[PDB]
Design a protein around this ligand. Structure first.
Ligand SMILES: Nc1ncnc2c1nc(Br)n2[C@@H]1O[C@H](CO)[C@@H](O)[C@H]1O
Length: 380
């Protein structure tokens, strides 16, 4: 009837899908062998619709859609939308009071998609990912949303699901799913949970309270324009300025050379979470002339220190807005791949006077894991 219910984390930049199979949560890998899929849609001049990794990694930016999560369930005239469309390379128009995305789907053919139709495309990819894994059709799902999502934003995420052919049984808050994944629900008494979520493009701090398996979101903070990509971009600036000093050339003149460096800078960033040095390598790069340079963990930290330190400010504001002190935090939950960064981990620990955060689940998978825990109960 309800079949195997899937747990889907529908993120701004990345998405993740999990299932409960043979007594445990399984985080499913896509057709590219990745356990997280970029929340990207691209259209090639030939007319092919690309979703995920193929859409993000395609060398080309007017016909590449991403960050639909910033527009979903919002009106065109929403000041947040108006501010956001200034940074989006694709066209956004007013249609049916909403911010519809306009793209050439190939051969000069123009189409408009509501932000829930783009999220539906990402959700279809997640569903295809789970169906390939399970060997059968998926009809039902548990989809997570940020704790601050209002009525319209939650309904539009439910609508995205319906378009993708999914019955979104439950909409669950992302920090709550993160807490469920660490088994913080299975505890007795009253506990205060600080969820520190540093994603690809958004930073969210949530103060939750657990009272006998029952969660309550007390206060939320963060910065909607601070995430992992901002860290990639700081590294990008360093290498663009250095290539200017070493060759007198301007890398930014070739868009594909920028995308190549962006992909290499992102791989290097991930490597510096485990090791102390990473090398970037690109052929030919720019004007046939090759690219080979190194990045140290210490330099990455120095290029991003102000952005890293800025994350402590909303943590202070949630504590105040919940009338709590550092001593009142029983559990610290780290969410998002960016929390793998050793300096981010050091900063959060020292802010909580040596208190160690929960560890076990990968922070980039915790929300889909928690969603897959709830999906399991619902599957039976
Ligand atoms: N190991 C890691 N070290 C540093 N960053 C990482 C890591 N893994 C992931 Br995934 N990321 C970044 O997290 C964001 C998505 O949540 C993206 O910007 C990713 O680049």
């Amino acid at each position: 009837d309800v079949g195997t219910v899937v747990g889907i984390d529908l993120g701004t930049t990345y998405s993740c899908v999990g299932v409960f199979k043979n007594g445990r949560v399984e985080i499913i890998a896509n057709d590219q062998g990745n356990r997280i899929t970029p929340s990207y849609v691209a259209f090639t001049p030939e007319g092919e619709r690309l979703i995920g990794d193929a859409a993000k990694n395609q060398l080309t930016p007017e016909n590449t859609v991403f960050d639909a999560k910033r527009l979903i369930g919002r009106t065109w005239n929403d000041p947040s939308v108006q501010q956001d469309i200034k940074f989006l390379p694709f066209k956004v128009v007013e249609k049916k009071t909403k911010p519809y995305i306009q793209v050439d789907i190939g051969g000069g053919q123009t189409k408009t998609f509501a932000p829930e139709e783009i999220s539906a495309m990402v959700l279809t990819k997640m569903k295809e990912t789970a169906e390939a894994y399970l060997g059968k059709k998926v009809t039902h799902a548990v989809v997570t949303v940020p704790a601050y999502f209002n009525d319209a934003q939650r309904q539009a995420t439910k609508d995205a699901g319906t378009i993708a052919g999914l019955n979104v049984m439950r909409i669950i808050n992302e920090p709550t799913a993160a807490a469920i994944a660490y088994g913080l629900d299975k505890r007795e008494g009253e506990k205060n949970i600080l969820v520190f979520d540093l994603g690809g493009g958004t930073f969210d701090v949530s103060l939750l309270t657990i009272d006998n398996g029952v969660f309550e979101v007390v206060a939320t903070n963060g910065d909607t324009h601070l995430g992992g990509e901002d860290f990639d971009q700081r590294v990008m600036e360093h290498f663009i300025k250095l290539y200017k000093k070493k060759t007198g050339k301007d890398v930014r003149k070739d868009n594909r050379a920028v995308q190549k460096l962006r992909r290499e800078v992102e791989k290097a960033k991930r490597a510096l979470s485990s090791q102390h040095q990473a090398r970037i390598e690109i052929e030919s790069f720019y004007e046939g002339e090759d690219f080979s340079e190194t990045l140290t963990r210490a330099k990455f930290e120095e290029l991003n220190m102000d952005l890293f330190r800025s994350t402590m400010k909303p943590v202070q504001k949630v504590l105040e807005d919940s009338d709590l002190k550092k001593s009142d935090i029983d559990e610290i939950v780290l969410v998002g791949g960016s929390t793998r960064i050793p300096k981010i981990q050091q900063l959060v620990k020292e802010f909580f006077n040596g208190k160690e955060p929960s560890r076990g689940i990968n922070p980039d998978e915790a929300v889909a894991y928690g969603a897959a825990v709830q999906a399991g109960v619902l599957s039976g």
